[PDB]
Amino acid sequence: SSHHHHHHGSIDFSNAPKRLNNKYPLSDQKNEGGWVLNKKASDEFKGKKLNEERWFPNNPKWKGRQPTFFAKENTTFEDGCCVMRTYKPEAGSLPEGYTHTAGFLVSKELFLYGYFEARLRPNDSPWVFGFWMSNNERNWWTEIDICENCPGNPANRHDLNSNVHVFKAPADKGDIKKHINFPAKYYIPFELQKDFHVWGLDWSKEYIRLYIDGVLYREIENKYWHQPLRINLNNESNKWFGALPDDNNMDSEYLIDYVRVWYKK
């Protein structure tokens, strides 16, 4: 697989949609899609505390990819953002194989189709930042990686990654016995970590459509992704991105301004 090197194309932002309102998707500000805001699941992240009726404060099903262990204390709320930090606790404090901590939130709600959007300021540190959706339930396990990137590794500053996975699917839902995925990366003309950007997903029975700052950059025929999914926000380690801890570069912040969810009227 060539996706460590291959930019399929570049993404042009000269005609990118202007922000007109905070009521509809950035890629559809005039609401041609007939969207309705999901007020249960959407979060503007105001205040100083997690809404723990809406979110789990860590990941109950995954401790983390070594060497980074998900912890509740790494996620705080400041100036209208969820803020995720990375720490190195004292030696011996974490379970075997783990040396650093990162934050993780999982939605208590499950979703099937709709528009999903998050405004994100990446951490400038060698941890992947993630806004993605997944579910592992009754031997059906699928995942949509709206945003899985690590510009905090300077070699990756101009990459925009995307992927979708089927880890397993029963006979009547795709019949997948071996993990399959479909990664694709694109060139972006700015360094991803410098500013907030808006990731969008228009997920329908027919297509997965992915948007960056309102610009469509990938379309996927929706063959397999018909399973309800939870929303995940987190930092993690991943050797593939060169996303391994750096004790001299771990003081950055992953900022989530909002998560917005819409359904069809």
Closest approach of Ca ion to the CB of residue 44, in Å? 4
- Is 257 part of any known ligand binding site? yes
Q: Which is nearer to Ca ion, 85 or 119 (CB)?
A: 119
From CA 57, how far away is CA 52, in angstroms rounded? 7
In degrees, rounded to 5, the angle at the alpha carbon of residue 95 between the alpha carbons of residues 92 and 101 is 85
Closest approach of Ca ion to the CB of residue 25, in Å? 16
Q: Which is nearer to Ca ion, 44 or 246 (CB)?
A: 44
Closest approach of Ca ion to the CB of residue 45, in Å? 4
Q: 146: Cβ–Cβ under 8 A, 6 or more apart, which residues?
A: 116, 118, 131, 132, 133, 162, 199, 200, 201, 210
Closest approach of Ca ion to the CB of residue 51, in Å? 12
Residue nearest Ca ion (C-beta atom): 80
Q: Which is nearer to Ca ion, 126 or 214 (CB)?
A: 214
Q: Which is nearer to Ca ion, 246 or 253 (CB)?
A: 253
DSSP output for 100-150: EEE-EEEESS-B-SEEEEEEEE--SSSSEEEEEEEEEETTEEEEEEEEEE-
Closest approach of Ca ion to the CB of residue 46, in Å? 6
Q: Residue 175, exposed/middle/buried by CB under 10 A (0-12, 13-18, 19+)?
A: exposed
From CA 132, how far away is CA 251, in angstroms rounded? 23
From CA 257, how far away is CA 191, in angstroms rounded? 19
- Is 253 part of any known ligand binding site? yes
Binding site for Ca ion (CB under 5 A): 44-45, 80, 257-258
- Is 124 part of any known ligand binding site? no
Q: Which is nearer to Ca ion, 69 or 258 (CB)?
A: 258
- Is 251 part of any known ligand binding site? yes
List binding-site positions for Ca(2+): 44, 80, 251, 253, 257
> Which residues are part of a known binding site?
44, 80, 251, 253, 257
